[PDB]
Amino acid sequence: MQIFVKTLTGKTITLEVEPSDTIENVKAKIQDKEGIPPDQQRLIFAGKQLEDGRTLSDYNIQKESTLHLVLRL
Amino acid sequence: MQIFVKTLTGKTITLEVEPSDTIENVKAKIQDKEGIPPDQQRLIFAGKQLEDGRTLSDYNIQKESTLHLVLR
Amino acid sequence: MQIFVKTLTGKTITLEVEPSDTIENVKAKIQDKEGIPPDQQRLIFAGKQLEDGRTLSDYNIQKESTLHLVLRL
Amino acid sequence: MQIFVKTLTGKTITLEVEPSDTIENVKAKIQDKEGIPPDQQRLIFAGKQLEDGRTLSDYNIQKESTLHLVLR
Amino acid sequence: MQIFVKTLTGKTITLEVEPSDTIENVKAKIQDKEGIPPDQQRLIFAGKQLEDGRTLSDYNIQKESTLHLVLRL
Amino acid sequence: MQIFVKTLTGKTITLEVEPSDTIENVKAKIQDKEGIPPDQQRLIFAGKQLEDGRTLSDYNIQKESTLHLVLRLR
Amino acid sequence: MQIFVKTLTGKTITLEVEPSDTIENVKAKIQDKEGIPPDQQRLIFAGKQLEDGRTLSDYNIQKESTLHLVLRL
Amino acid sequence: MQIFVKTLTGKTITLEVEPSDTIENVKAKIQDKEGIPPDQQRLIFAGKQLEDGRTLSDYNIQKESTLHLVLRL
Amino acid sequence: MPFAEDKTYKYICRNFSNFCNVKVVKILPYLPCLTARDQDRLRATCTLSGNRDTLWHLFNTLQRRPGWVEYFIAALRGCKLVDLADEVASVYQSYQP
Amino acid sequence: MPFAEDKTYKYICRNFSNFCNVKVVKILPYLPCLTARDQDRLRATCTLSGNRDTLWHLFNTLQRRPGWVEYFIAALRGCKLVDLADEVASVYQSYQP
Amino acid sequence: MPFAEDKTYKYICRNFSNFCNVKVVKILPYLPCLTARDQDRLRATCTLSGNRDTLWHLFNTLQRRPGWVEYFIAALRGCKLVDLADEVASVYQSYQP
Amino acid sequence: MPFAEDKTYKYICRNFSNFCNVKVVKILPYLPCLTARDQDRLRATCTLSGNRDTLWHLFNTLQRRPGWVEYFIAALRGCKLVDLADEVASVYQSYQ
């Protein structure tokens, strides 16, 4: 499954995850690709906070669904 | 990689920089060609003040871009 | 005095009226050259029906004004 | 009244009539020069169908006026 | 007195009816004129179901007033 | 009667169909001209889908009327 | 300074005046040119009646200005 | 500090006023500068009849800020 | 009979000054046709805005429930208030098909 | 009577301070001429924005309803506003042709 | 006093959570300055949407009424909120000329 | 726990008919999470338009507040209304 992680700067990141994947594991995937630690990561999907311990299928992320990644210190 | 920092006086400025340069670089190039000490100017790009630390690429400055210069 | 009434097909006609005439008097005088019977005429001025019993001056019409003549349905 | 009624093909028909003359006078004289039966025609003046009984002056059809003759 | 029954298909059907008639009478002749038997019919006037046994004048239906016909299922 | 169906590709398909023929018949003609399986098609007539069972006259599709064809893709 | 005065008849009146002149000077001096009695005039500038007493410069009347003249009749 | 006193006619008066100056002093400055009596003024700034007792800094009138001077009868 | 009942409600609206006798809190127990939600609105309105203002709410609410006139009359004379009840009935039975 | 009833409403607008004492929710039940839609829109407005912000809507909604005047006086003096009722009536019956 | 009244209202806004104890229905009788329409409108909002959603409407309507501060203080300390009334006074005459 | 609380409100909205028994005027003292302003709003709405027309306003106002489910369950069984109280918990605690 393909998802889009759109940074605030506009750059779009594509990830291969499964709907059973944890948000924590997803945050690790963004951390791998361009180095933002999961602590500084805060994903927003459908205008909603993504709680850290829950899987994507809980929020119903499908293929090519887009997540917004906003960084806070 | 050309930029045009428009001046209140009305005369534009031809500055040749590259996105790698930070603002103190372009401020210095402003310090050179015009004579304003860098601390006394404040570049502005489409209503977005340029923080001194950052680089022109951070603000998506591209070829033939037009900045703005305000004194004091 | 010299008032206009415009038939609904466009052939406006000039009338030699007096302000204090009852509307019958103006209505009665279309027939004298045109021939619609008084019951058929439904005069309209400034979007207000003209009840026949009252007078022209009652509805505050000045000279050279226009009246709209629409046939009774 | 000399009028310019234009058919589908685009060719215009000139007609010497009078505002006293009614539409059948226009329609019947088309038969004498065009042959299309009077029931077939229906003339349109500025998007308004011409009732046959009424006369041209009823519709403000003045000198050099254009009529549309749509067949069928 | 003429009334209309605008079926949802758009088939506008003219009915000649007297105001004193019952609704069954309208329901009866609408079958004879077009064809649905009454028990699949449901007259709608003024956005209000019409009782079977009532007269037309009880609903204050005037001439040229248009009923609506829907199909009971 | 003679109708046109508009495809996503832009090219419009002419069809020699009678008003009696059902949507199955008109959809089979699409396959006979292009090859898209009838299930894959979803004929649309002026912002309204076309039931597979109803004939064209039910939807009031006279001559030279246009249709829209959309294909379940993945 | 010169000023232009329009008229109902369209015969535009050109004048030779100076700003400190009062309208009493303007209104009277038309009479000696056009014969309309000073009381008969009712002169308009820019859609604003000009009072008889005051002067042109009060209303910002400038060179080659276009006054409007309106009579009672 | 410069401020501008703009009457309703349109003319603008520049005034060399100090921020601690109370309104009556400003009205007094209008006296010698123009000639309007001290009571006849009505200083209006940013839509607010300027009270006579207060001072400019109380209303926060900055440099080259404009006052609308309106008259009484 | 969802039309003869509807006409009856128009009779009550016109002759409203007759019905000010009936008190809502003393009639509400005798109206099963009122839902447990609508009873709460009436008892709250009656407590808030007096009784007379509530009568229009009772009738306007009552006229929506099916077969209300039959219960209303049965309830309306359930308050020993028979002289006014039988009138709503004379409006009703004298208008059935 | 389409022209006297129009004039008395024109009278009410120009003499509107006299009607400040009318309480809308105590007068709506005694106005049968108002349709059940209007009696529900006025009460909603009265509940939302006080009473005297509704009086103008009530009178501006009465003057549409045909034959509203004869009801209005009956409502006014049914609301113990007899002195006001006689004065609005006087405008009516005096102007009758 | 058009100006000291103006700022006193701004103090009320800038220190508004101090006034949360003011009960509207218990203070309206104490405010003659409020016009018969506003009293009717505030009492409707208070009923519709509670009390503390009306406080800001009470103060925003008071500040237009003439001489409200003198009435507000007298009302406020007449409502046993003396510790809050003198706070408003300690602004008003502490800002008078 | 901004999600298990979030679903639990969707559970209450879905199974809302079971909550008709909750009397708002008798439950508000048991819900400290509701601020002083909302208690005034709910009490006024309960006074203006009955009880069961306020219930939906109560829950839709509870679910804003932090840690409401923990309070609501205690309030629900504190109001002698326990058959429903354990239902709400069994939806909340089940989904941590």
């Binding site: - | - | 609904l8 439904r42 309209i44 400034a46 979007g47 207000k48 029906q49 709209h68 629409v70 046939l71 009774r72 349905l73 | 589908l8 229906r42 349109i44 500025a46 998007g47 308004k48 169908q49 011409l50 009732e51 046959d52 549309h68 749509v70 067949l71 069928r72 | 605008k6 003024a46 956005g47 204050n60 005037q62 040229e64 007033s65 248009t66 609506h68 | 109708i3 046109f4 508009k6 419009t12 002026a46 912002g47 006279q62 001559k63 030279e64 009327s65 246009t66 829209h68 | - | - | - | 389409p2 349709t35 839609r37 209007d38 829109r41 549409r64 309803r65 045909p66 | - | -």
Partner: protein, 199 residues
């Protein structure tokens, strides 16, 4: 059935009844079903609606169809656009087949019924009230689902703006007058029908 082609016949009809259908065509919703129209053209027509009003845009729409080559079968695409956008009266003047168009008496009579509102619009604009005539108007089915949205929106800046814009919508529906008099009658506006008819 026909004695010519199908494209010039339609170009002729929009050249004959241009002044007629200009009244009956609501160009804002009809643009949805004109798929053959390029999006840039529809934008220009769309902008004209907001700038110069409906009847000017319909002139532009009928102008741009008249001058310009389109895909085959646009005529029935246009006519079908009119039918299901809720103004079938304009469709009667656009069928290349002729029996659909109204009888000359009907078209003539509905010129007076139109002029009767324009004379009496100030009376209607006062006494009418969109909050209650609107819903009963849809039941009579002379206001489309899309008109009611635009009526209710024009009601936002006043009632009279709703009426001024209802009376602009209903004059485009087939046999609207006798249908309108009903809508007045099953509402409280029994006074208007007397003013609007003289009974």
């Amino acid at each position: 059935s026909n004695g010519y082609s199908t494209d010039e016949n339609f170009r002729y009809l929009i050249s004959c009844f241009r002044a007629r259908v200009k009244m009956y065509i609501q160009v804002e919703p009809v643009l949805d079903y004109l798929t053959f129209l390029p999006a840039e053209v529809k934008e220009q027509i769309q902008r004209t609606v907001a700038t110069s009003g409906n009847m000017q845009a319909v002139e532009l729409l009928l102008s741009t169809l008249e001058k310009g080559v389109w895909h085959l079968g646009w005529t029935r695409e246009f006519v079908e656009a009119l039918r299901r956008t809720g103004s079938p009266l304009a469709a009667r003047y656009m069928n290349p087949e002729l029996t659909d168009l109204p009888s000359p008496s009907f078209e003539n009579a509905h010129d007076e019924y139109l002029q009767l509102l324009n004379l009496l619009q100030p009376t209607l604009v006062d006494k009418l009230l969109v909050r209650d005539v609107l819903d009963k108007c849809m039941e009579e089915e002379l206001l489309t689902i899309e008109d009611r949205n635009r009526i209710a929106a024009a009601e936002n800046n006043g009632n009279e703006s709703g009426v001024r814009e209802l009376l602009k919508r209903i004059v485009q529906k087939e046999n609207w007058f006798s249908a309108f008099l009903n809508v007045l009658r099953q509402t409280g506006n029994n006074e208007l029908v007397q003013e609007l008819t003289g009974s």
